[PDB]
Amino acid sequence: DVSYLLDSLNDKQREAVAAPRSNLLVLAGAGSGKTRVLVHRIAWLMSVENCSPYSIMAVTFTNKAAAEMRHRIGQLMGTSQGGMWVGTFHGLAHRLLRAHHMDANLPQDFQILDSEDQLRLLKRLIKAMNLDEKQWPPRQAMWYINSQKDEGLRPHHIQSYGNPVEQTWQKVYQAYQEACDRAGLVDFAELLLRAHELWLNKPHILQHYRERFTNILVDEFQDTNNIQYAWIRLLAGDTGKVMIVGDDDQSIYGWRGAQVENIQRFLNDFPGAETIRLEQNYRSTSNILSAANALIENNNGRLGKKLWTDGADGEPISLYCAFNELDEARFVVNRIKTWQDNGGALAECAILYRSNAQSRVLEEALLQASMPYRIYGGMRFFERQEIKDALSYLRLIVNRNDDAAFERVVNTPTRGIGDRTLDVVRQTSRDRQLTLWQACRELLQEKALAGRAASALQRFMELIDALAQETADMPLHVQTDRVIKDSGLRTMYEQEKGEKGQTRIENLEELVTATRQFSYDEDLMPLQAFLSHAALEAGEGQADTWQDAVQLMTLHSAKGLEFPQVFIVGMEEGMFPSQMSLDEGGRLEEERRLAYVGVTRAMQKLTLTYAETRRLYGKEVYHRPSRFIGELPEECVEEVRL
Amino acid sequence: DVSYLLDSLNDKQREAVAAPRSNLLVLAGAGSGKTRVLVHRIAWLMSVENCSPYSIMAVTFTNKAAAEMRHRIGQLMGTSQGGMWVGTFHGLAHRLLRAHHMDANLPQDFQILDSEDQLRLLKRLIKAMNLDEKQWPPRQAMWYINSQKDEGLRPHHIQSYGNPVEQTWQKVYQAYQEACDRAGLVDFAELLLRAHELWLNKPHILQHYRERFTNILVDEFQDTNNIQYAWIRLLAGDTGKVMIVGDDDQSIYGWRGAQVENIQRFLNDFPGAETIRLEQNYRSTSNILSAANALIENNNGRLGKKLWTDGADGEPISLYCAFNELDEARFVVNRIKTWQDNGGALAECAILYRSNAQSRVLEEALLQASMPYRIYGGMRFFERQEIKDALSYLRLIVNRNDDAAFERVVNTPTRGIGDRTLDVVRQTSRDRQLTLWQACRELLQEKALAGRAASALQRFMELIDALAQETADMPLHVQTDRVIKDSGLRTMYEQEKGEKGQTRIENLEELVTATRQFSYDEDLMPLQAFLSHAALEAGEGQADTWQDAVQLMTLHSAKGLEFPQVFIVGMEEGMFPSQMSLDEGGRLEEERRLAYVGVTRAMQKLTLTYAETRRLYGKEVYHRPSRFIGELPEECVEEVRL
DNA sequence: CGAGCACTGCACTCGAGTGCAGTGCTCGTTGTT
DNA sequence: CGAGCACTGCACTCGAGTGCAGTGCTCGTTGTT
DSSP: OOOTTTTTSOHHHHHHHTOOSSOOOEEOOSSSOHHHHHHHHHHHHHSTTOOOTTTOEEEESSHHHHHHHHHHHHHHTTSOOTTOEEEEHHHHHHHHHHHSHHHHTOOTTOEEEOHHHHHHHHHHHHHTSSOOTTTSOHHHHHHHHHHHHTTTOOTTTOOOOSOHHHHHHHHHHHHHHHHHHHHTEEEHHHHHHHHHHHTTTOHHHHHHHHTTOOEEOOSSGGGOOHHHHHHHHHHTSSSOEEOOEEOGGGOOOTTTTOOSSHHHHHHHHSSSOOOOOOOBOSSSOHHHHHHHHHHHHTSOSOOOOOOBOSSOOOSOEEEOOEEEHHHHHHHHHHHHHHHHHTTOOTTSOOEEESSGGGHHHHHHHHHTTTOOOOOOOOOOGGGSHHHHHHHHHHHHHHOTTOHHHHHHHTTSSOOSOOHHHHHHHHHHHHHTTOOHHHHHHHHHHTTOSOHHHHHHHHHHHHHHHHHHHHHTTSOHHHHHHHHHHHTTHHHHHHTOOSHHHHHHHHHHHHHHHHHHTOOOOOSSOHHHHHHHHHHTOOOOSOOOOOOOOOOOEESGGGTTOOBSSOEEOOOEEBTTTBHHHHTSSSOHHHHHHHHHHHHTTBSSOOEEOOEEEOOSSSSOOBOEEOHHHHTSOTTTEEEOOO | OOOSSSTTSOHHHHHHHTSOSSOEEEEEOSSSOHHHHHHHHHHHHHHTTOOOTTTEEEEESSHHHHHHHHHHHHHHTTSOOTTOEEEEHHHHHHHHHHHTTGGGTOOTTOEEEOHHHHHHHHHHHHHTTSOHHHHSOHHHHHHHHHHHHHTTOOTTTSOOOSOHHHHHHHHHHHHHHHHHHHHTEEEHHHHHHHHHHHHHHOHHHHHHHHHHOOEEEESSGGGOOHHHHHHHHHTSSSSOEEEEEEOGGGOOOTTTTOOTTHHHHHHHHSTTOEEEEEOBOSSSOHHHHHHHHHHHTTSOSOOOOOOBOSSOOOSOEEEEOOSBHHHHHHHHHHHHHHHHHTTOOGGGEEEEESSGGGHHHHHHHHHHTTOOEEESOOOOGGGSHHHHHHHHHHHHHHOTTOHHHHHHHTTSSOOSOOHHHHHHHHHHHHHHTOOTTHHHHHHHHTTOSOHHHHHHHHHHHHHHHHHHHHHTTSOHHHHHHHHHHHTTHHHHHHTSOSHHHHHHHHHHHHHHHHHHHOOOOOSSOHHHHHHHHHHHOOOOSOOOOOOOOEEEEESGGGTTOOEEEEEEOOOBTBBTTBSHHHHSSSTHHHHHHHHHHHHTTEEEEEEEEOOSBEEETTEEEOOOBOHHHHHSOGGGEEOOOO
């Protein structure tokens, strides 16, 4: 064969793309265009080493990356590649679970418990027993459990005691799996575990897929957890081969449970395995690439890597030291406002912080100078309340056991159903181990409820069965517009605040637009499909009419980005490195890897700043410059006695 | 010794007064002077036979009688006569019970239960099980109960089961007894029975009394029931010499338990007991006595007698056959209208009827002619609702277990202790066998009652306890004045219609005066005393300004009276004899006796009338003259063709 | 400091209880303590 | 004829349950699916 595939790469990359079929690692750099090498490795497995698209399987963490993945593959391999699996660990585990739902013990219409829902269903359960009041907040409960699923530990697994400190939780977890089951719901963290668990109870399947997907890819491997690794390991027992990109230096998701180890753990658990070091940056200047290396070398146990450019060396890394953040910002604004004055495109920037709280003062400085911008704060469409109300009824329709959907929209729009009443259904639901709708069917037959109550409560349940019916044989975007009206939510929202509700309604109708444009082989009804598309990805926040404007965001939400001009605010001991990390955890190296990520972000200039004084909520305060600025080859940096 | 206890008597009376201490029967026949005989005999018993006022016991039936009896004895015995027990059965009975409450198995503060009280208490019972629904009518239950005690039976006596009919009642009677026993309530029948039983049970007391009361005297003996007869026999073992007085031909209270036979029963149970007949009548003309003797001879089984006189024959008994009762009345009025014109007094004329329904037509007729009149029926003071009411709070203060007092004032004035709430308290009492106040302490304690219910119920209770408290040191009348005020009773009646409302507060005021003049003699606490004298004698109607008026009453309540002029009305077969007395049980002879009682009430002229047609509730009916008219010797009756 | 959420007054809803008029259907007597 | 009497049929009281807007008082990483 000929190669129009490689001619666009450089030996290193080229070496990886053309690599023999077998296990390996592709220690990506940071301007090494790792997506590219991946886009081509598949172009190769199908072209050169001639493998069927039905054996290839890419896997990403974000839907966005794994989607832009599917794109380029299609722009290279001119067409569509059926049989292939390019998704997230989650969406892919889902894919399996929906298919072999039976095997894994899951109703074909199970529902994905998102963050908020899971937390609530927890706050609710904690109460049906002990007393949360700081003693057992819901969050730590959420944490403890995910932490467990991140480790593939079901209730009856982690034995202990002598310390009820743990046992207590151990019990709550028990309930959670119980409650979530009866309801027929599963959490993000569940998909993975439930899936992997299938390959340990349904071997003949485990075979089937190895027996198929003999080629596997896994982007950003430094961010996997112990149950993800353990899942993949099995897909490629021996028969299957597997490439894995990654980079231990950019594993700032250790708290989310990302075993920065695993990268190495791979080389070992997999005897035969090579290694490639794409170390050529095409994103930033040499002056910058340097600062990175020294700085990033202050860690240890690394695999080490020298980041080299082939372009210029560019301007130094100016350093400011304002009296207070009021200045620190005002400085940056002027430093950016000048960039603009000089045909500078305000989108080619990015104030980066260690804590979202740091952004407020940045905005006032900005707005105090006719300069648009836009934070990347969460709150994606499908997370907004008005929408989860809407989708909650829909869930009740696809299933009357969505304990989460129920306890949410049961008395919303307020339909005269108070807690005194609900607390009964709970204590019922709880003591008789039932879903809520189940306790209702009972508490009504048993006629053990107030006249007022039962009559209202019941008025509710009928409203649902009513909607399930009245809309059944309907097309999504119509069934939706109905439920929105017929549940009185629209009504509930046309009567809401000033600036507030005005959007609520709009978001609702967009929910319809959206629904009228949702697309998807048949293996689930157009709703259950949607309700899943809703849980597994939200995204949206009002893509500000491009009218050129700044880019504010924490560092964690900046990985994968690059901007001509870039800044890092709050460069001082306290925030960076963090307080709750300079002491709270000894996870000090992470904070470094981050700064490393933050720098591998600049393209031309790069500015680091910090103030002597700043009010960390409430009282006044003074820190000392970040230990990070010092570990920088001093010839790169440049003070600014402004 | 000299005699002036005799010179005023007639040969026959003397024969009785001076008779020797032994058992005799003075068969007095109306106009006989039986009261005089009883009085002189007693004076004789002390004066001539030298018995002590402590060995003599005169038993009458009405308080009225006893009173008169007493007055006269002291007029002949120009003094006091302490020690003498002169009273009505019930009265005496009760005296004993209070004195020997202990051995009688009764609280020293037992409360007499009057008719309303009794009847209502049953209504609750029957209802607290059975269905009054004409199948087990309270009246019928009551009737059975007293018919039982007149006979001195008891629940655990007349055993049965061969018909639930007598068995249900049997049960009802059972419930009733425990209820009364638990409440410290004794009914009129109980008074007598108990008293008898006490003598059967504690022979050492009977003895005391036999030893003391060696001289019995019983008035109106043909009206005695069995229990009374029995009671008389014991106190008259073999040592007691008893004189009875009465007339078997004037026995008109059979339906109310009287046993006319007891007159002959006295002659058998005590042989050698001779008989003296008082036959010289001093009230009516020879012509009237004449018809009398004939009318009555139609009954058989009598001891017979001949009412004679040493006076004029007088005008004959006249008859008027009115077209209808509207005319009959008119007629009577006219006849009376003459008598008066001729200087006669209206008060010396009496219209007599079999039924009370018969007075309206007459009152009207009397009205129509500006003829003043007074009707001898009457609501009695201590029966008036506003008086039992008032007395019920006082009762609750003496004892919280007066289930009757309770059930009465509990929610009147209305206090919110609504009905539904009581059915609970009622039942709770049934199932657990407790007083209504008892069953409350519990329902309130066990917190088994609703908020409202419990709260009101409580309010009432504390009030009673409050009045009890604030009143313990107050002289009866003050206490009564406060309970009437503070129980909210006054305000209630101060705001009642206008007709009733006005009289009512006034009666309530009379009550305070009453309790103020009340006089009793260390034996019982004032309040307990009064409450007793309030149940044993209710007297009073409206002591009408002695404005000359025509006398209206029934033959029954006419007995013992006398008038120059009398008019018996509606001598129509069906009316009199009453229809009830033609089928109901061969109680014909009694109806004749009734007639006999009527004729003998006239002094000068007796007039008998009867309509051909009359309206009898709704319809017009047509009766035939009473057979009684016939039975009158022709020589004494003169038609009256107007 | 602003963010969030028990956490608490306070107006309301609502229906079981109250309290009392309405309606339809008997079937009738005498009355002290 | 109507008194007595279950019942049914309001209108009303009243307190348990809602329905929300308003004061505070704790506690502060990072964020995909």
